Putative amidase (Rhizobium leguminosarum bv. viciae), 921 residues
Amino acid sequence: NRHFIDADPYPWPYNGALRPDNTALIIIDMQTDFCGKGGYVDHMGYDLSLVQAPIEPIKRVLAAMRAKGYHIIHTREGHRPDLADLPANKRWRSQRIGAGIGDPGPCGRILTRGEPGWDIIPELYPIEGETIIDKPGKGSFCATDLELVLNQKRIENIILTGITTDVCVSTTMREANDRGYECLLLEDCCGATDYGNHLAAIKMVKMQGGVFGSVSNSAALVEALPGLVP
Amino acid sequence: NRHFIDADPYPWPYNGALRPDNTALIIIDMQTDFCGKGGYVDHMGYDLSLVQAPIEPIKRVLAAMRAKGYHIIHTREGHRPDLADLPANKRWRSQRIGAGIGDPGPCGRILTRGEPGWDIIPELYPIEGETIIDKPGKGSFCATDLELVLNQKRIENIILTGITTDVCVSTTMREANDRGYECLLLEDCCGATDYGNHLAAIKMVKMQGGVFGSVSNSAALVEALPGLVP
Amino acid sequence: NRHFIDADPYPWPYNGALRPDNTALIIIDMQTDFCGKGGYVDHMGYDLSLVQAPIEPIKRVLAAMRAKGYHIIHTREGHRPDLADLPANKRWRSQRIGAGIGDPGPCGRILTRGEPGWDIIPELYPIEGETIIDKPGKGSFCATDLELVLNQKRIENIILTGITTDVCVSTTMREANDRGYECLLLEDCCGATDYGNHLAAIKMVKMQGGVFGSVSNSAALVEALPGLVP
Amino acid sequence: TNRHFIDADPYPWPYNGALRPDNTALIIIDMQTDFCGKGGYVDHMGYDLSLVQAPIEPIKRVLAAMRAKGYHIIHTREGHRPDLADLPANKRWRSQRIGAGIGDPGPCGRILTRGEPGWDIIPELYPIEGETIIDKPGKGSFCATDLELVLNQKRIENIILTGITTDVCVSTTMREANDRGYECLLLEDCCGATDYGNHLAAIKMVKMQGGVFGSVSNSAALVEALPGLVP
Ligand SMILES: [Cl-]
Ligand SMILES: [Cl-]
């Protein structure tokens, strides 16, 4: 009994095996550091409106996926307080542009775990039973236990949201896709530091018959989402 | 002691530690399947001139990097002949599009190791002592020994070339960057299935003070390349 | 519809979900370099009879598992001909004890891929459709595509054989076990360079209620193996 | 040249004598109440706690000396997320069958669960600021963790292993590090196991084939030959 979501470039998931037990929502880096005033992204001068746009659409998707018993996953980009997991190059680039990782700012130490700006925003806050991944990189798989958690939960399908589209969401999508996870990007549930770059990251997914998976949007997903009993 | 390459958005590498012993050139997927007549990409109708453009610029970079004793790395996307490393979704999408992985075409079985179309093109062919990575995914790190080879060679700096810009080159850049490798993308030594997508993948690198490293071009690299002796 | 194999310290697999589609036999490093005259192990002076002992038991297990449609996996420890994947410490230790990796011997370059001594012995030779893993380390997961192949084949159960019990078989078991694979070591289908060490690697598995899985033997497995429904 | 060696078996460690505070780390593996304390995981399965407490004083001497000479210090804890999302079904089931269920309530709290009293590192070997702690869901410290990433960023080449248990957590971690090219030293008096025979055999496995996983030495030999920083 297969179920499909209207998507581009093909009906998602590819084989219609869409159930709450094999499908997860992943909300990527909806932190004050990426979309709040005083955080990492605001420091570099980027338009916070572009990364706040996805907040309400992700909320509708989260509420619907929570209600139908789907697996829910959240990620935070961040570093250990002693910065032992912070590559030297990553730190130096952040310092040069005036937004140094580990440096004090209005929301505390930029991109440091346990600091106010680093935490997930209240509107999209995790509840009990939802796995949070704390990652030192852009991709959620690198140096984390995400893949191990996904295997133990026997998850085959991943629906990606969050920020930024072209950096954190996209790297995570490519990692999942390479390892065989079947992925759906929701275009209205993500935003980037450059709007052209946001749209191009979406288009990259559609090439070669869906090279990294397929693309849809929050309304199309929620109107066709299956529950536990069919 | 330090050496820099003129790059955008900062002089590369970040700390000027640029030597033949800690720096590698990586040539990504310069295979007939990605830029030849009769292969995977030609099958899907994409403009072969966009992916052939980088051939001569890569050749000039390779000749200069070979001459100064730099580490040279090549990659081929491909699958085991029995297709045991081919995720079901990857295969199905390629079939829908009319360019099925493992299916017979003019250059043999599409994207299958040991087939004519799968091999690296003659102009950029590896010589003895240059490591070739055979990868089942878009990123060169996933399910390969690339990282292990890089650590044994004590390589810190990576200069990326090849195709496609927004798929194979970009995923590999994000993997390397996340693990702390300091990377340089040469914009004239890569090309993609959509030219807009090629330029946007280049621009994505430059954001946030060089989120995935820095960008330059073949001439700027070759004119400022150090040898072992100052 | 559960099936169990009589094993120590518990009936294997834990949950009785034992089928040809989710279970693989893994034959580890049955190469001339580990059990042949003139190879790596014979060079270090070890008793070849200890590592030849498992040949007939593995043959019976392989024939039965091949006949009932089970997944079959083989591994070879070895290095790229240019030795780019050979850590400096590994090489140096092999040279000190007179069995240098890459060095010429009676069966060719020790532990080098493509050389006679490196290949799997004739008695246990792979047939088409059986995945061979070429690994640069002791564990079959490190820097390989084993895990990726396992996931695409939806394999949950692994039955380990080969040499050496305490080095290559054991490392591979611990990697699989950590990632959640349910493993069975067949005690008569493995052997080591020290017989005490072989018996202790078997005992290590049984501790803490089966810390790495369970232990059984070739006869117990073959008489209780489930086949397909015709 | 400016090389330093530690007297070890079967060869002087490290192999190439490149032994400095900046490229060498001490790793203390799973010295948690759950592995060596009263009321924890290991005590639940009936094992002799004296075998796993033996290494406490030797590790203390090695830690004090390595802390004093500016060496990198690493600690690990085996454990699981409170919702048990990182706990394989087989691992859980085996722990339940032998009466020491992971996540189940006991005297020191939920067995092998992060944030619980029994799960934490014992007081005698407690981490100080600037020492990386790895929280791992498996026996090997590399699997599903950021250990390797931290090691690379710190440009660490040499690892000196201590902790428990010798044949399970220490040994798996050694094999992972060794495979990826790290040069490793096991200190035999700074580790202990649930079976003493198994502890001695895990030590012997290291020495085979000219040091298949590295070399073996002991706390006294290490501390008297440890190079310091140049003031
Ligand atoms: Cl200078
Ligand atoms: Cl104390």
In short: The beta strands of chain A are 23-28, 71-77, 104-105, 108-109, 131-135, 157-163, 182-191, 214-216. The interface with chain C takes residues 148, 151-152, 179-180 of chain A (CB under 8 Å). The pocket of chloride ion (ligand 1) is lined by residues B 1-2 (CB under 6 Å).
